[PDB]
């Protein structure tokens, strides 16, 4: 648990930001170059608020699998000269299962807060927000509004992004290496 | 930072609880025997709600120094057969200063959340909530309502209990070994 927290803190410091869209406030994880990720329901427009700053969105892909089914992730290209530290090496080729994970949030609401969520299990199918959704990772923690975009990690691994909950369990969309080339 | 988180998680698991009083919801740290601590402003009555459960308060000391000055801590004797694990060994004889601390919260609002608050400095005097108050530990973190009772820790050390903030800094009352005999 210790090293997983240490890893999470350094990842949030280097690669994470607080984002506001017309749809609420989110944690945002920068991945490589100028590409970052939000939950698809953040519904980012032409311009987002990133650490209170008007940033232009050059391009935005809502992710779907081979059937055209929703993965609940939007990739965003940001109009800024700073490049993110490339964290593709920390992203698995397939859904990861883990016994201890930490969920990391960085919003006005939950500023630099870290949650030990316990066991993460692959949960693949889930009817999320009414929508059938694949590649969900599940943890038994009472997750709330304001936590979306939260980054789920274990030692040296970025597992997924928090996208929903049913009041008793939370679910991350798996953040897979092939989404980023 | 890793071992401090590991220490904090195990301390909250063993010794902490969520308490509701007429004055709000708090994190509560059990110390030894049947004695626990809240911020004095929790203003615990004859009966508190402890993890949703009606618990009787046998005795309650609001703490003050030698001048009769407020320390912003209430010690509570609880009417329950379970004794807390004795954590007096983790309590310093005087105010502790540290470069990395973790603040741990356990409420409905902030369930099992851990915050790396950075440097803790002894701050002794502060006019808190209008009231002159001594033995304050300071950290530069945007602490909010709902975080009172939060437990401030470093590796193998319980430093104090979170009792206030001014929107930019937070302050813990130092939890000193001599308060508990
Ligand atoms: C993040 C929002 C955020 O950060 O706020 C910005 C300020 C939310 C976290 C969730 C909500 C409750 N707990 C959480 O961890 N995420 C959501 O709100 C998403 C949003 C969304 C929108 C559109 C399409 C897809 C996703 N939705 C859910 O988590 C969803 C909402 C259901 C719900 O409780 O809210 C109401 C108000 C609409 C009723 N949860 C869900 O579908 O799971 C329930 C379920 C599970 C299994 C089978 C059937 C239903
Ligand atoms: C914990 C409350 C909680 O858990 O809610 C239960 C559901 C609060 C955390 C604080 C509040 C804001 N940020 C925090 O970290 N703590 C308090 O509210 C305490 C309460 C209290 C009451 C009576 C006597 C002593 C303490 N008070 C403060 O933190 C205090 C409040 C000032 C304030 O901003 O609130 C208003 C609404 C009353 C204006 N803060 C304070 O005095 O510091 C300001 C200051 C610093 C230095 C010099 C002069 C003023």
Whether residue B146 lies within 8 A of chain A, CB to CB, comes out as no
Residues of chain B contacting residue A141, judged by C-beta atoms under 8 Å apart? 111-112
- Catalytic (active site) residue B41: yes
Q: Which residues line ligand 1 (CB under 6 A)?
A: A 24-26, 41, 126-129, 131, 143-148, 164-166, 170
Taken as a whole, chain B contains a residue count of: 181
The answer to whether residues A51 and A72 belong to one domain is yes
Residues contacting A6, CB < 8 A, separation 6+: B1, B2, B5
The pair of three-digit structure tokens given for residue A8, joined into one six-digit string? 């999470």
For residues B114 and B157, state if they share a domain. Answer: yes
With beta carbons less than 8 A apart as the criterion, state whether A158 and A95 touch: no
Residue whose C-alpha is closest to residue B144's, from B163, B126, B165:
B165
If asked whether residues A113 and A176 sit together in one domain, one would say yes
CATH of the domain at A89: 2.40.10.10
Residues of A with catalytic roles: 41, 72, 148
Chain centroid to Cα B51, Å, comes to 16
Instruction: Assess whether A145 and A114 both reside in one domain.
Output: yes
Task: For residues B104 and B145, state if they share a domain.
Answer: yes
**Among candidate residues B51, B84, B117, the one where a domain is terminated:** B84
State the distance from the centre of ligand 1 to the C-alpha of A164, rounded, in angstroms. 5
- Experimental approach was X-ray
Q: Are residues B66 and B98 in the same domain?
A: no
| Total domains present in chain A | 2
Same domain, A113 and A175: yes
B111 in A contact zone (CB under 8 Å):
yes
| Claim to verify: residue A104 and residue A65 sit in the same structural domain | no
- Can you read off the two tokens belonging to residue A128? 């999320």
- Whether A123 and A78 share a structural domain: no
Tokens for B77? 């004797």
B2 touching A (Cβ < 8 Å): yes
Q: Mutate which of B115, B136, B148, B151 to test ligand 2's pocket (most atoms within 8 Å of Cβ)?
A: B148
SS (H, E, C) A119-150: EEEEEEEEEECCEEEEEEEEECCCCCCCCCCC
User: Residue A112 is nearest to which of B2, B5, B116, comparing CB atoms?
Assistant: B116
Q: Which ligand places an atom closest to the C-alpha of A167?
A: 1
Same domain, A106 and A138: yes
Q: Is the CB of B144 under 6 A from ligand 2?
A: yes
Please name the residues in contact with B116: beta carbons below 8 A apart, sequence gap of 6 or more. Answer: A9, A112, A114, B1, B5, B100, B101, B102
How many other C-beta atoms can be found within 10 angstroms of the C-beta atom of residue A62?
A: 14
The sign of the torsion formed by the CA atoms of B108, B112, B116, B120 equals positive
Domain membership of residue A133 as a residue range: 1-15+85-181
Q: Identify the domain boundary among B84, B102, B125.
A: B84
**Smallest Cβ distance to B2: which of A6, A112, A116?**
A6
Domain boundary (B37, B66, B84) is at B84
Full 3-state SS string of chain A: CHHHHHHHHHHHHHHEEEEEECCEEEEEEEEEECEEEEEHHHCCCCEEEECCEEEEEEEEEEEECCCCCEEEEEEEEECCCCCECCCHHHECCCCCCEEEEEEEECCCCCCCEEEEEEEEEEEEEEEECCEEEEEEEEECCCCCCCCCCCEEEECCEEEEEEEEECCCCEEEEECCHHHHC
Do B114 and A114 make contact, defined as CB atoms within 8 angstroms?
yes
State whether B23 and B52 are in the same domain.
Answer: yes
**B114 at A interface, C-beta within 8 A:** yes
Q: What is the resolution of this structure in A?
A: 1.9
Let me know whether B42 and B6 are in one domain: no
Provide CB contacts within 8 A for A141, sequence distance 6+.
A103, A115, A117, A118, A169, A170, B111, B112
């Amino acid at each position: 648990m210790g090293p997983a927290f240490e890893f999470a803190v350094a990842m949030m410091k280097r690669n994470s930001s607080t984002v506001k869209t017309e749809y609420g406030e989110f944690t945002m994880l920068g991945i490589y170059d100028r590409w970052a990720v939000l939950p698809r329901h953040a519904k980012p427009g032409p311009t987002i608020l990133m650490n209170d700053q008007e940033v232009g969105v050059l391009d935005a892909k809502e992710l779907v699998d081979k059937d055209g089914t929703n993965l609940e992730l939007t990739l965003l290209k940001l109009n800024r000269n700073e490049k993110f530290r490339d964290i593709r090496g920390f992203l698995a080729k397939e859904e990861v299962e883990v016994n201890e994970a930490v969920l990391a949030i960085n919003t006005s609401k939950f500023p630099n807060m870290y949650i030990p969520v316990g066991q993460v299990t692959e949960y693949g199918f889930l009817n999320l927000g009414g929508t059938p959704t694949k590649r969900m990772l599940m943890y038994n923690f009472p997750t709330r509004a304001g936590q979306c975009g939260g980054v789920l990690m274990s030692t040296g691994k970025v597992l997924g992004i928090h996208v929903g909950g049913n009041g008793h369990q939370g679910f991350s969309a798996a953040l897979l290496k092939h989404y980023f080339n």
